[PDB]
């Protein structure tokens, strides 16, 4: 029983309301087609693209908003699991040796649509993607360049709209960004909301984003880092990643690790700052690192470094 919520339905109808137009698997798919095929100019696609709000992308959009950096937001975008994914064949992010990054949007074919409708369509996706970039990823900096699909036409109205150089060539859409943007902070970053929001995504979304973010080890490390002083069971972690414990163990084993080793890496790292703090007793360091008593911590710490905790604190 596959039932999807139709997030695109409202913004489509908002466009129709604004333009005073009356309309005759998801209901939005047929409506979108009708709007596109009845467009009187490809430029109208730019207006329709404006009607997609970040909130229209649902919990995936919340993850984007709360991501730590622009680079991390682009990892989520690369999963191709946002609104237009049926119409997008793939999204690539390519580093250049030219201090720029290309975000390439590859579009699915529309062989039954005429050439004007296909240009209209590309403008909708470009305008909507631009809105996301603008509100969230650009901030102060600007787009270097925008490439839209080849046609015989003037670029003026597009440079008017996007306020950056634009040209027509090839297939799909490419946004060129300054490379330094990737490490820039997202203004609404919130790592707790980000991790929580990923966990609310679908099984398929979770598998894909885990891959794009660097794999299961990295995913678990990021999750534990947000949980500043909690050390969850593998059961709880598997739940957050939308996988069974068995699957998680296996995928960790493929990356050549295991859950206990990942947990202890985070604990060891955290213990570095705790055993320098002169105000804490070893007892308090143990409790903070999730151990049930001091002796179990001492044995673990010994196992990590090969040195005793009190001797380490001095040296």
Numbering used by the authors: 5 to 28, 39 to 329
Provide the authors' original text about this structure.
In this study, we present a novel AraC-family transcription factor, CdpR (PA2588), that controls numerous virulence factors via directly regulating the quorum sensing Pseudomonas quinolone signal (PQS) system. In this study, we showed that the new QS regulator CdpR (we named PA2588 in this study) directly activated PqsH, the PQS synthase. Like VqsM, CdpR belongs to the AraC-family transcriptional regulators, which control a variety of cellular processes in bacteria, including carbon metabolism, stress responses, and virulence. CdpR is a substrate of ATP-dependent ClpAP protease.
The structure belongs to P41212 space group, and it contains one PaCdpR protein molecule in the asymmetric unit. The overall structure of PaCdpR can be divided into three regions, i.e., NTR (aa 5–203), connector region (CR, aa 204–228), and C-terminal HTH domain (aa 229–329). The NTR is of PaCdpR that is of α/β fold in nature; it is composed of ten α-helices (α1 to α10) and five β-strands (β1 to β5). Four helices, α9, α10, α6, and α7 were packed against the β-sheet at the edge in an anti-clockwise direction, while α8 (the longest helices) crossed the β-sheet in the middle and formed extensive hydrophobic interactions with the three central strands (β2, β5, and β3). Though both CdpR NTR and EcAraC NTD are of α/β fold in nature, their overall folds are different from each other. Altogether, these data indicate that CdpR NTR has a novel fold among AraC family, and its functions need to be further investigated. Although the overall folds are similar, structural comparison revealed that the detailed conformation of CdpR HTH is different from other AraC proteins. CdpR HTH contains seven α helices (α13–α19), which can be further divided into two subdomains, i.e., HTH1 (aa 229–271) and HTH2 (aa 291–329). The largest difference occurs at the HTH1 motif, especially the helix α13. Instead, CdpR HTH1 and HTH2 mainly interact with each other through the backbone of loop B (aa 303–304) and the side chain of Tyr245 from loop A. This interaction was further enhanced by Arg281 and Arg284 of helice α16, which connects HTH1 and HTH2 and Tyr305 of loop B, via H-bonding and stacking.
